[PDB]
Write a structure and sequence with these properties.
10 helices; binds 7-[2-[2-(3-fluorophenyl)ethylamino]ethyl]quinolin-2-amine; 16 strands; Bovine Endothelial Nitric Oxide Synthase Heme Domain, Chain: A,domain 3; binds 5,6,7,8-tetrahydrobiopterin; NOS_dom_1 (chains A, B); binds protoporphyrin IX containing FE; 35% helix; heme binding (chains A, B); 3 domains; Nitric Oxide Synthase,Heme Domain, Chain A, domain 2; metal ion binding (chains A, B); alpha+beta; binds chloride ion; Nitric Oxide Synthase, Chain A, domain 1; three-stranded antiparallel beta sheet; 14% strand; homodimer; four-stranded mixed beta sheet
Chain lengths: 362, 362
């Protein structure tokens, strides 16, 4: 009954995958051995080629992603061989190192063993491999409020943060058979951070802002041909707005706009002065400038939008239907200055794809 | 068969309308005389009260409108008595004068005779009562490109613009029975315009930018209880972004960002400089400052969003379901700085409401 669902997703995936790979004739045979493997074993195993391409397709089908133009150059690391938590840790450590690449970020995914009977083999608790802790007790707010629950969960497990605004959370994941996850402190040598400075305004450094170089989302499920890789951390490079317009700007995050307004020497008293808008722009100029000055890869929303237009064109030229989430594709600053704002997108879900899954904590 | 459709929309409207007006007991009687009027005559006539409230409800149900908090103070002018084109013109002239109110803009609607058998009594060709002409021939682009087709249509009818970037289009409308519309030049004395200057940057005036004080949309159909008022021009005051972020900024409109960047003394060479974003902010600061300095009503997107939050609260407190179009409610600058961005809205269409209708020209 579940062999059914698996079989249909499998048929659809192999057909599309081998078609794209120019291996159309191999399909019929490949489906046979798959159908056989399903009957006897309950599931099937992807070849390295299928898995590599599947992850790339998944990125291509991510409606909310503006950076999809480079779907085909995704660096896929196959770690389905891991069995121990030391291996998982070392693989996670390695992902960080190779994705970072001294600042020349390589879009990478590391793929761990998939679910068996819906039973996880590895269960990553981090939202990103690199993320700042968040604390809130009596009156006191420290760090990233988005990290409050995971931070408290880590501190249940014997970890303790220094309670700076930028404590690096430890890696935290659970192996099948264990009741509790384990946690490992990150080697500082592996984690690139960027101090935020401004090209014109020397006072901007007084804010003592910084962010991490590489966003590595690690709580999403990669689905490929009926196979559920619940643990498959992936990364790209940042679009500046993600940091300057949200992470540092949102009132429910770091909430820096009033402070930005002060150091750039404008008043924050009247809405009609548009001080938030002005602060947002200077803060976002600062983020791009800082990353570029350090030699850490990053893209601005305009260039990113230009690239996404190429992606649209490429999709059409290749005879592929385009899907997208307009509400997530438009950047949070000057969205009407991008072509994205002025057209609409079909928000249909196509597989392979990346999905949300329930948090183990909370 | 059409008496049916009319009757159902009527029943629904009267029930809701008299409920809101505290006149619940009058409903049963009101429905009787309505049902009778439908049978014999094919339609029915709204009382001044019903019509006034209906227009207010329509504004309340406008999913795309951020300014809905003040739905209940809409100034409704009942011009269902008009029969001649001189009367229509004078009513349109009067709408402009009273809505403008020396700069202290009053949200107003003027309601003309509704459709009979789907047959229009009056047919307004203008998109707004006050709008700038647009021209494009060989290489030459002049004025508002959004006005190109209507401008060419007016020039078919014997009108001629001076071909400045800000030619006021004449009022153009057609009376039932006439094959062609008529056109009337606007008295300059009735039209307030605002020159765009900047609070800090004196050079900003070199751009010679200006806009009109009052946006009076005149091509939408007001629908109330099955009755189709195809000609019912309405106005509010401007949100600054409408002018500074779209009308003057869009590449397919006035396309001023590169020029703004120059007069404010920044380079327009690199995307990572965010010069468009910076230009957008200074241009939008200029628009708000200029309108306020002239004493012409206007709102910024933050204040407008604050007001719309009150509208949400008011809707809930009154037991009314809220409907909205997220893609139109978010402002085109700093949308993530408003609460609108961070929640979702139900985009259901509720009547009474304002609708698009086909252009008579093109
Ligand atoms: C190469 C540079 C990349 C850039 C600049 C980029 C840009 C973005 C941005 C700005 C978002 C919106 C995130 C937010 O609003 O929080 C996004 C969403 C997303 N991106 Fe990308 N991306 C890149 C690479 C990738 C890669 C390598 C993958 C995976 C293979 C990926 C998959 C996604 C997914 C799944 C989402 C949506 C996540 C969610 O719904 O929460 N992207 N991308
Ligand atoms: C009082 C001040 C008002 C403000 C600041 C305001 C603000 C806005 C804004 C910014 C838009 C988006 C327009 C665009 O993106 O092109 C909008 C749409 C709209 N507003 Fe309002 N509005 C106001 C009053 C009114 C009034 C009096 C009515 C009618 C009774 C109205 C009905 C609408 C409608 C129907 C739309 C959508 C039109 C369309 O879909 O093209 N608004 N409003
Ligand atoms: N630059 C990139 C590259 C790949 C990405 C892949 C996924 C995402 C989504 C990250 N945000 C998800 C929503 C979320 C979840 C948890 C906390 C938050 F603040 C926000 C962002 C990306 N950014
Ligand atoms: N400030 C206000 C008040 C009421 C409004 C009522 C309606 C509208 C919609 C105006 N724009 C409609 C879309 C459109 C149509 C035609 C040309 C364009 F450039 C744009 C704007 C309003 N702005
Ligand atoms: C496709 C998209 O809905 C369309 O381009 C919208 C986007 N949001 C908008 N929002 C406003 N206020 N005005 C507009 O004209 C548009 N255009
Ligand atoms: C309701 C709405 O879809 C939600 O708040 C979205 C809006 N668009 C977004 N766009 C991006 N890129 N990231 C987000 O977190 C959100 N939040
Ligand atoms: Cl992030
Ligand atoms: Cl307008």
């Amino acid at each position: 009954e579940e062999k059914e669902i698996l079989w249909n997703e499998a048929k659809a995936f192999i057909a599309a995958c081998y078609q794209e790979l120019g291996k159309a004739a191999e399909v019929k045979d490949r489906l046979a051995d798959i159908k056989s493997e399903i009957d006897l074993t309950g599931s099937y195993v992807h070849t390295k080629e299928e898995l590599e391409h599947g992850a790339k397709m998944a990125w291509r089908n991510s409606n909310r992603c503006i950076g999809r133009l480079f779907w085909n150059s995704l660096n896929v690391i196959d770690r389905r061989d891991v069995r121990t938590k030391e291996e998982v840790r070392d693989a996670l450590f390695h992902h960080i190192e190779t994705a970072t690449n001294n600042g020349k970020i390589r879009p990478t995914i590391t793929i761990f063993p998939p679910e068996e009977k819906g039973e996880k083999q590895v269960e990553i608790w981090n939202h990103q491999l690199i993320r700042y802790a968040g604390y809130e007790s009596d009156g006191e707010r420290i760090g990233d409020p988005a990290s409050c629950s995971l931070t408290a969960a880590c501190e249940e497990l014997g970890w303790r943060g220094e309670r700076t605004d930028f404590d690096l959370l430890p890696l935290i994941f659970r192996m099948k058979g264990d009741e509790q996850p384990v946690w490992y402190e990150l080697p500082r040598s592996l984690v690139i951070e960027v101090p935020i400075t401004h090209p014109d305004i020397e006072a901007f450094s007084d804010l003592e802002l910084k962010w991490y170089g590489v966003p590595i989302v690690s709580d999403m499920k990669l689905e490929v041909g009926g196979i559920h890789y619940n643990a498959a951390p992936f990364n790209g490079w940042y679009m500046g707005t993600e940091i300057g317009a949200r992470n540092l700007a949102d009132e429910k995050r770091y909430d820096k706009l009033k402070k930005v307004a002060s150091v750039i020497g404008i008043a924050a008293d009247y809405n009609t002065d548009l001080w938030k808008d002005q602060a947002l722009v200077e803060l976002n100029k600062a983020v791009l400038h800082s990353y570029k000055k350090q030699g850490v890869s990053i893209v601005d929303h305009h260039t990113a939008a230009s690239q996404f237009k190429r992606f649209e064109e490429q999709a059409e030229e290749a005879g592929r239907k385009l899907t997208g989430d307009w509400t997530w594709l438009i950047p949070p600053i000057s969205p009407a200055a991008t072509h994205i704002f002025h057209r609409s997108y079909d928000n249909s879900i196509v597989k392979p794809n990346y999905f949300y899954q329930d948090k183990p904590y909370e």
